[PDB]
Structure formats: C-alpha cells, structure tokens
Design a protein around this ligand. Structure first.
Ligand SMILES: *[C@@H]1O[C@H](CO)[C@@H](O[C@@H]2O[C@H](CO)[C@@H](O[C@@H]3O[C@H](CO[C@H]4O[C@H](CO)[C@@H](O)[C@H](O[C@H]5O[C@H](CO)[C@@H](O)[C@H](O)[C@@H]5O[C@H]5O[C@H](CO)[C@@H](O)[C@H](O)[C@@H]5O)[C@@H]4O)[C@@H](O)[C@H](O[C@H]4O[C@H](CO)[C@@H](O)[C@H](O)[C@@H]4O[C@H]4O[C@H](CO)[C@@H](O)[C@H](O)[C@@H]4O)[C@@H]3O)[C@H](O)[C@H]2NC(C)=O)[C@H](O)[C@H]1NC(C)=O
Ligand SMILES: O=C(c1ccc2[nH]nnc2c1)N1C[C@@H]2[C@H](C1)[C@H]1CN(C(=O)c3cc4ccccc4c(OCC(F)(F)F)n3)C[C@@H]21
Ligand SMILES: [Ca+2]
Ligand SMILES: [Ca+2]
Ligand SMILES: [Cl-]
Ligand code: NA
Ligand SMILES: [Zn+2]
Length: 804
C-alpha cells in the first residue's frame, strides 16, 4: 500500500528514492505502481510536442509545455533539444564536421567528464552497416569515435543476463541473473519478466556500476526507465540532470531503448518494418547530441552506444518438441525457447533420472536442432554452470530454432519472427559498441571484444576502482586516449626445480616396458636435456605458476614441460612445429613403449600397471611422438612424464588433433607454437581444482583424471614471418576439450575423425584467459610486446564464424 496523498511538485525524477510511506516520483515509480497522483500531470508533460518551431522562439515561459523555447530555457536546462538550431541559427550536431576531441572541454565546475551509456536492446551488429543510410547520428558517432565491428554478448544472449553483465563485469553464473526466467531452489522462489519477485535484492549479485560509483563518491543518474516514459522525456530528464548544481549533478547516466528488440521479435531482424525503429533510435541519439551541444557538453561527455545482444530469424514452425523424444514428458519442467533448461517437475519423484533423459535426447533424429548437455559439459567458453539457478540439464539450441515441451505450449501460450538467446558466438547474436568522447580515441577501429570487459572501462572513465569481476583490466586500454589502467603481471608463486639424472632404471617398478637400445652425439643429448633447444620451443617464456605447488622443469630436444610432482603429470608442455616439420608414425616396436624418466622419482611418476588394470582408462601423450624431429628424439616422447590419462573415446579426438591438425596449422600459419596440458575442474567453477577436489583417479592409483585438455596455438600475426622468428603482434587460437569417456556429443563420431573432430574442437574454442583461470598459470611472460596488447591477445576468442 502506497500513500499517494503526497505530491511530485518540484520532485520530478528525483534522484534519491523517497522513503515509504511516501508516493514516489522517480523514473521507476510507474513499475512499482507507487507514483504520486500528480506524477503524469507535472512530470510527463507532453503539451506542444518535443521540438521548437520558429514562432515559439523567445516565447514567454509556460510551465505546461513539454519543453521550452523561452530565453531562460538554457539556464533552466529545459529547452527542447532543437532550440538553438531553430531559434539561434546553430547547426544540428550531425551536420558538423567532426573534430578530434583531444581534451575534455567542460564548463567550469565539472570535476570529470560525465559518462552517458546509451543502451539499445536487440541492436544486432550488422545494423551498423546495413542500416547506415537511415542512422546518420549513430554513423557519425561510429566513424568519429572508437568502434568495434561487433561486441560479444554473454550466454545466454537474453536481455537481463546481458544488461546486468554490462553493469557488473560478471558472467551470469556469478552475478546470478542466469536467464530472463529462473527458479532458485534455495529460496524456493521464481524470477519472471512479469511480476514483482524480480525486484527482490537477493537475485542480484556482484556490484553494479551505479553502486560502485556511489560508494566511491561519484553520483549516478537512475539507470532504469519505466516503459511508458517516452524516449524524448528520458533524454530531456538526463539533460536536466546535467544542469544540476555541481554538488547535486550525477557523473554517470544511462538511457535505455526497448527498440529495436521489440520490433525485431515481431518482424525478424531484417523485416521491412525494421527501418522505422532504426530511424527513431537515430533521431533520439540526435536529440541527445543536439541537447549536449546546447549545454556546451558535446565535447565534454563520454558517450557509449552499446547493445545487449542481436536478433535472429525464428518462427513457430522451427520448434522441436520434447514430447517427440521423452515418454515421461509430464515429469519434467522445461525453461523453453532459444535455450532449454530441464529439471524434475517434483522433487518427491525418486524415479527421475537425468541420465535417461539425456540419452533419450541424444542424437535421436538426423537433423536434430538442439543438443543436450549436463551443464558441466557445456563448452567452458560459455561459463554457464556454477550457479544453483542453472538446471543440471541444458539444451543448446541451434540458431533459428526453438525447443518446447509439448505442441500445446506453442499454440496455446505464428506471432513472432525473431528471437535471441542462442550460443554467444553466433553471428546473429553479436551486438554493437561505439565509444565517443574526450577519453575515447579518435576515428579508431578496435577488434571485437566481450561485453564482460566494459565494466572495467566504465570504471576507468569515471576514475573508479572496479569491484572484482571477470573482465581482464587493461585488455581494452587500446580503446582509450587516456585513463588507461596499467597493470603489472602477477608474481610467480612457485619456482620450479630443474632436476638432473638422479635415478637408475632399476629403481622403477612401474610395469612399463619399452624396446629401446659416441662422444659427438652424447654431448649433444646432454645439452638438449640441459635446455639447449629451449629457445626454440619456449617462445614466450615459461608460464608462471600462480599458486603453491611442487613442480619440475623438464627439457627435451623437441619439447619442454612443467611437470607436477603433485598431479603426476605436466601442468603444461610447450613445443614449436615449423612449417617444414614432417609427420612420422609411431614405429611398430615402440607401439606400447613407456620409459621411466631418470630425472623424476618413481614416487612422483605414473605407472603402466594402473592403466593396464583400469579397464576404462588408457593414456596419451602431451608432446606427440608423431612430431618428433628425429628417430632418436622420438624416445623422449615416450617418457612416463609426457604421459596423461585418456579415455579411448577421447584418444580418437586427441590423436587426430596431434597427427593431423597441428601440422595443418603449422602449414597454414607458417609454424605454430603449441602449449598443451590437463585441466581439473570437477566443481565446474571455471577455476583450477586443488588436489582435494579431484573426483576420479586412474583405478588403484593417485593419478588424477583431467576433466579437460587444453591447447594454446600461437604464431605470428604477419604469417610471412615464421612462428619462431616473429617481430611483431602474435596470433592465437586455443581450445579446452572435454575429456569424456564417450563421443555422444558428436552425432557423427562413428565416421572418420576427418568428419567430426574439427567441428567438436570449434565448439570448444577458448580464450587463453579461460585456460589461465582453469590452470592457475600465466602465459606470455616474455615477449617484446606491451602488456596491454598481451592482455588483449589473452582475451581473444577464435569463433570460426564467417564475416559479420
Ligand atoms: C568471475 O569473477 C568473480 C568475482 O571476482 C569470481 O567470483 C568470486 O569467486 C570467489 C572464489 O570462488 C568467491 O570467493 C568466495 O566468497 C565467499 C563469500 O562470498 C560472499 O561475499 C562476496 C563479497 O561480497 C559476494 O560477492 C558473494 O556473492 C555470491 O553469493 C551471493 C549469495 O549466494 C550471490 O548473490 C552472488 O551472485 C554470488 O554468487 C556467486 O558466487 C558464489 C560463491 O561465492 C557461488 O556459490 C554462486 O553460485 C555464484 O556463482 C557472497 O555473498 C567466501 O565465503 C568463500 O570462502 C570459502 O572458500 C574459501 C576457499 O578459498 C575458504 O578460504 C573459506 O574458508 C571458505 O570456505 C568455507 O565455506 C565453504 C563454502 O561454503 C565450505 O565448503 C568450507 O568448508 C568453509 O566453511 C570464497 O572466498 C567470490 O564470492 C566470487 N564472487 C562473486 C561475485 O561471484 C569468479 O570466480 C570469476 N569467474 C571466473 C571463471 O574466473
Ligand atoms: O521485459 C523486458 C524484456 C525486454 C526485451 C526482451 N526480449 N526478450 N525478452 C525480453 C524482456 N524487460 C523490460 C525492462 C528490462 C527488460 C529492460 C531494462 N530496462 C532499463 O531501464 C535498464 C537500462 C539499463 C541500461 C544500462 C545498463 C543496465 C540497464 C538496466 O539493467 C537491467 C538489469 F539491471 F536488471 F540488468 N535496465 C527497462 C527494460
Ligand atoms: Ca586401461
Ligand atoms: Ca574448479
Ligand atoms: Cl531464460
Ligand atoms: Na557419437
Ligand atoms: Zn528481446
């Protein structure tokens, strides 16, 4: 109950929310149904429209007008945005040549350039090119400021997860807003688009930008707007706030547009009805910029034009129904649409089994348009598991499709031609970024980047220290003219041992066998074991270990490794494969060869007997024998310290990568440097497991089984230079392959690895940064590149999509 008895007199769009029981006058009161009786009358004035006309010029003030064209309007801060153009001979901002903004040109009393975030819902990245003719204000921002060809949203590519990621720098799994619709089993409460539960603070984790600003003494405009407040009034309100006295005026503001998303759902992303919403958005940007110009703020304010996600073509007829797959369809609850999330309809149903639901959903139809996963098996790049609000069973839905429980849900709940929510590497889901202002660079294009990085930059723009978040601070320094953030590399926590030959063959009782059999060549092999070729295979310095552990550096002719005495295998193995390198086979006599490593105690070694006994588990090697530089160097690849546990199903994947793909990349990229290793993430939190988190060992041993295997493949960005003699920027692609005992994820896996392995790898593409979180390692410590450029390289994701 609200005491709507109060008045909004002089409180219109009040910045601090008034305490109950009082009627509210803030931009969100509509949505709470708590506005004062006179809110519409005093605060949502419409009389006379939004534009000055020649006859209105120098009129006597009439407080009933929506905006004013009287002489005092500028100093009152409430002129219509076209006032100086219609009445004072000025030009519209869009008609002015752009001029570099080298420094902020702010009125006296501004302690920092204000930040305005202009967010546009559903603004697909290709709209910038495809709509350019009808968006002249936006086009000017884009070509005069700093822009990316596109910006990557987070998964799922839905409205609330992405707006709140923009605000916090966090993945949905960490901020807690994991969909537009959610059930939290601890609260036993549901979050919906319609309704009041979504206003409860307990849903909203991390620390959004407005809160970060407030805590550090920077005042914020209210970011959220009731849908019924027209866009023109939102713009007028921000401009009015910008006229407040120095002590009252906010430094950060947000405008939000429900368009083009609203129309995109109805008409599809490129429907002919889409031109008008785009024109109208541009007109709004033009009113803002004209309005800033009148206030002498157009060369003072930093403006971010940013979308939350794109929009894809999706229609009723492209719906998969779980009732075609599951006999037990009424025993599940599905969160439906462009993603699926499944849980038991009732917690009292003891006959509910996720394994049988998964199996009934797996590769059941030739062109099946969704794929089931236990959430811990989703591509790690999605970071979509570590939240109790994310159901154990997930359906990744093909672009252009929906999943639903039963046909009745679709025709009794066609209409829409667009939707979003799909995998965040999908081109149609990409959105936009443009930065314009004194702190952004001039006429500069930057590579695509992820929206999780923006919170840091917005903090930088406002001189704030960001709360802990998933961005990599410094990775977007190249967007900025100043206010860059200069981080230091993390300090290495553990130093390696460099073991020499310390054990005799006979001290090893590992159940291992190998058919293995001159001072010129013997001085040579000794030099290689001391690191003589390390400069060839360790191109960017050794990775630093950022946690407390015990490990050894092991040198070889063809590869170098950091070998964990705790996990009994390498944390990392590093090797370089030149364009000229030749692939060989494992000679027949060496087929089951495993050799003790005389530098490493039996007590810190794997053993072959454990693999023999473990009927499910086999082994592979991190440096592949196929790539050995000579028959003699090949023996190094069979060392027990190069061995890792591998399910035979995974060996199919791993063998193809090592035998076929590495050489292919080396030929295509002019040499590659490869770092591979294991990953343990049994609690699916995207972070390196400690030894006590390991859920699976090779039977009868203390050899921990990895959940994933990574590789990082680096070469020269200028591919006319070979990877090992590169003078400038680097180029990287990486992956985090799930280590699974079956290939159920690949519906074509009965076929030859040339028909399905590369597709699996593409799906499990990763950023180096993802691997760093998962391993506690820090890569690229010794390059001739600036650290910020390396941070950018570490956040790179090779997506394998075609051109935007
Ligand atoms: C992306 O960036 C983010 C932010 O940096 C990274 O997330 C951080 O990860 C940290 C390491 O896991 C984590 O630190 C833990 O914090 C615990 C205290 O947390 C509360 O306070 C903070 C600060 O205000 C707050 O942010 C937290 O908010 C979480 O929880 C609330 C309520 O549930 C949510 O609203 C909110 O969305 C957020 O949830 C997310 O994180 C939690 C984990 O905290 C998940 O469970 C959720 O699913 C969701 O993802 C909290 O309000 C602190 O208690 C922890 O300490 C325990 O463990 C350490 C191990 O080092 C040990 O030293 C301690 O003794 C303690 O152990 C005891 O508790 C254990 C668990 O109950 C128990 O098993 C033991 O036996 C002991 O009794 C821990 O330090 C930090 O909270 C989050 N922050 C956020 C915002 O998510 C994230 O990792 C990055 N992602 C990647 C891939 O890099
Ligand atoms: O019902 C929907 C909706 C919209 C499009 C849909 N497509 N498919 N389903 C949909 C459902 N809503 C309506 C609400 C919310 C999404 C949008 C955020 N809003 C801000 O003023 C606003 C503006 C912001 C501007 C910058 C940063 C954050 C902002 C923020 O934050 C919202 C959050 F905090 F909850 F994340 N809110 C109002 C709009
Ligand atoms: Ca075995
Ligand atoms: Ca973990
Ligand atoms: Cl959702
Ligand atoms: Na298969
Ligand atoms: Zn939408």
């Amino acid at each position: 109950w609200t005491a709507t008895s109060g008045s909004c007199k002089g409180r219109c769009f009040e910045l601090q929310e008034v305490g109950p029981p009082d009627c509210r006058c803030d931009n969100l009161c509509k949505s709470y149904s708590s506005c004062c009786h006179d809110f519409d009358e005093l605060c949502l004035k419409t009389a006379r429209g939004w534009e000055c006309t020649k006859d209105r010029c120098g009129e006597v003030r009439n407080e009933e007008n929506a905006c004013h064209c009287s002489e005092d309007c500028l100093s009152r801060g409430d002129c219509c945005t076209n006032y100086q153009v219609v009445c004072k001979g000025e030009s519209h901002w869009v008609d002015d040549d752009c001029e570099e903004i080298k420094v902020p040109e702010c009125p006296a009393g501004f302690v920092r350039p204000p930040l305005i975030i202009f967010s546009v819902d559903g603004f697909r990245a290709s709209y910038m090119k495809k709509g350019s003719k009808v968006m002249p204000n936006i086009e000017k921002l884009r070509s005069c400021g700093t822009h990316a060809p596109y910006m990557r949203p987070v998964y799922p590519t839905k409205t609330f997860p992405n707006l709140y990621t923009l605000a916090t720098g966090l993945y949905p799994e960490s901020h807690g807003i994991v969909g537009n619709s959610m059930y939290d089993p601890v609260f036993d409460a549901s979050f919906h688009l319609r309704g009041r539960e979504k206003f409860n603070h307990r849903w909203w984790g991390g620390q959004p930008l407005w809160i970060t600003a407030t805590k550090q003494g920077v005042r914020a405009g209210t970011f959220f707007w009731s849908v019924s407040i027209p866009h023109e009034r939102r713009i007028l309100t921000i401009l009015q706030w910008l006229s407040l006295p120095d002590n009252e005026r906010p430094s950060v503001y947000a405008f939000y547009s429900e368009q083009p998303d609203f129309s995109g759902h109805k008409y599809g992303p490129f429907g002919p009805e889409m031109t008008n919403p785009l024109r109208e958005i541009d007109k709004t940007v033009g009113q803002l910029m004209d309005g800033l110009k009148q206030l002498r703020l157009h060369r003072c304010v930093n403006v971010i034009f940013v979308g939350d996600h794109g929009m894809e073509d999706v229609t009723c007829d492209r719906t998969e129904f779980l009732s075609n797959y599951l006999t037990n369809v009424d025993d599940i609850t599905l969160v439906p649409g462009t993603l699926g999330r499944i849980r038991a309809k009732s917690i009292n149903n003891s006959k509910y089994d996720p394994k049988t639901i998964i199996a009934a959903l797996t590769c059941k139809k030739p062109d099946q348009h969704f794929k089931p996963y236990m959430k811990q098996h989703l591509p790690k790049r999605l970071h979509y598991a570590n939240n109790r609000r994310i159901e154990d069973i997930h359906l990744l839905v093909d672009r252009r499709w929906h999943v639903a429980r039963k046909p009745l849900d679709v025709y009794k709940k066609c209409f829409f031609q667009g939707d979003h929510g799909f995998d965040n590497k999908v081109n149609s889901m990409q959105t936009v970024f443009v930065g314009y202002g004194p702190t952004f660079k001039y006429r500069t294009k930057v590579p695509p980047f992820e929206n999780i990085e923006l919170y840091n930059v917005m903090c930088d723009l406002l001189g704030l220290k960001p709360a802990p978040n998933n961005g990599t601070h410094g990775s977007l320094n190249h967007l900025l003219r100043t206010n860059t953030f200069r981080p230091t590399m993390p300090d290495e926590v553990s130093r390696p041992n460099y073991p020499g030959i310390m054990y005799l063959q006979s001290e090893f009782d590992l159940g291992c066998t190998c058919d293995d059999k001159n001072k010129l060549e013997e001085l040579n092999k000794r030099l290689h074991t001391k690191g003589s070729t390390k400069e060839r295979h360790l191109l960017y310095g050794r990775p630093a270990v950022l946690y407390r552990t015990s490990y050894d550096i092991l040198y070889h002719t063809d590869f170098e490794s950091g070998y964990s005495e705790i996990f009994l295998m390498p944390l990392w193995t590093s090797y370089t494969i030149s364009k000229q390198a030749e692939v060989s086979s494992i000679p027949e006599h060496l087929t089951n060869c495993v050799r003790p490593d005389v530098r490493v105690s039996p007590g810190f070694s794997q053993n072959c007997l454990a693999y023999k006994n473990d009927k499910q588990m086999s082994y592979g090697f991190l440096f592949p024998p196929y790539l050995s530089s000579s028959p003699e160097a090949k023996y190094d690849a069979f060392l027990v310290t190069n061995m890792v546990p591998m399910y035979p199903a995974f060996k199919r994947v791993w063998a193809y990568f090592q035998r076929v793909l590495v050489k292919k990349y080396a030929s295509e990229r002019n040499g590659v440097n490869v770092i591979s290793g294991p990953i343990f993430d049994y609690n699916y939190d995207g972070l390196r497991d400690t030894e006590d988190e390991i859920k699976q060992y090779v039977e009868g041993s203390s050899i921990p089984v990895p959940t994933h295997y990574y590789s990082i493949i680096t070469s020269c960005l200028d591919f006319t230079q070979p990877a090992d003699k590169c003078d400038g920027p680097l180029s990287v692609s990486s992956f985090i392959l799930p280590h699974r005992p079956d290939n159920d994820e690949s519906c074509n896996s009965s076929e030859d690895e040339s028909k399905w392995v590369e597709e699996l790898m593409k799906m499990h593409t990763a950023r180096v940064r993802d691997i760093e979180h998962l391993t506690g390692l820090d890569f690229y410590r010794k390059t001739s590149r600036s650290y910020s450029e390396i941070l950018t390289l570490k956040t790179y994701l090779h997506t394998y999509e075609s051109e935007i």
